[PDB]
Design a protein around this ligand. Structure first.
Ligand SMILES: [Mg+2]
Length: 179
């Protein structure tokens, strides 16, 4: 059985975008951060440690617009206990139609790979937004690369990518643009 259910009626017409979390939409740390966007208590082996979460600039406008344009899916190599709470707080618009975590990845040569063929979507209408090439080794032609983000508060990358996504939201085959 495939990773995603059948697309709901308002989604099946649209391109699927699988979206990366860490260093794509946010940067998270165990090391304390003073003006954090949010903080998640996470249990590692019976001990609760605080995860300090920074929101990449323009992420609200990015997720709002992407949820209109696409069937958005969160696909992260991190674990649900960290990533769910993060998504709950990040996703104000119901942009993420589904969530996928580390167990859904494939560990290949030391790296967690998002394997798009397991999705249940026609690959001509699947895109992946990620910050490290290794997460899409199997599907480089489906990828929209993004720089790894940590704390650069004048980064504009998510905002600057939107017109490109406007374009892709409308094509029939994504390989026609990502040749
Ligand atoms: Mg990442």
């Amino acid at each position: 059985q495939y990773l995603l259910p059948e697309a709901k009626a308002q989604d099946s017409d649209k391109i699927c975008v699988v979206i990366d979390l860490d260093e794509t939409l946010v940067h998270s740390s165990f090391k304390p951060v003073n003006n954090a966007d949010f903080i998640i208590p996470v249990e590692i082996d019976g001990v609760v440690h605080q995860v300090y979460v920074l929101k990449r600039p323009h992420v609200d406008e990015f997720l709002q617009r992407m949820g209109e344009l696409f069937e958005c899916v969160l696909f992260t190599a991190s674990l649900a206990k960290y990533a769910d709470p993060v998504a709950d707080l990040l996703d104000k618009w119901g942009a993420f139609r589904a969530r996928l975590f580390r167990e859904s990845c494939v560990f290949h040569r030391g790296n967690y790979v998002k394997d798009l063929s397991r999705l249940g979507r026609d690959l001509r209408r699947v895109l992946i937004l990620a910050n490290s090439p290794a997460s899409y080794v199997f599907h480089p032609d489906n990828a929209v690369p993004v720089a790894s983000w940590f704390d650069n508060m004048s980064d504009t990358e998510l905002h600057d990518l939107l017109p490109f996504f406007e374009q892709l939201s409308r094509v029939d085959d994504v390989y026609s643009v990502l040749r």
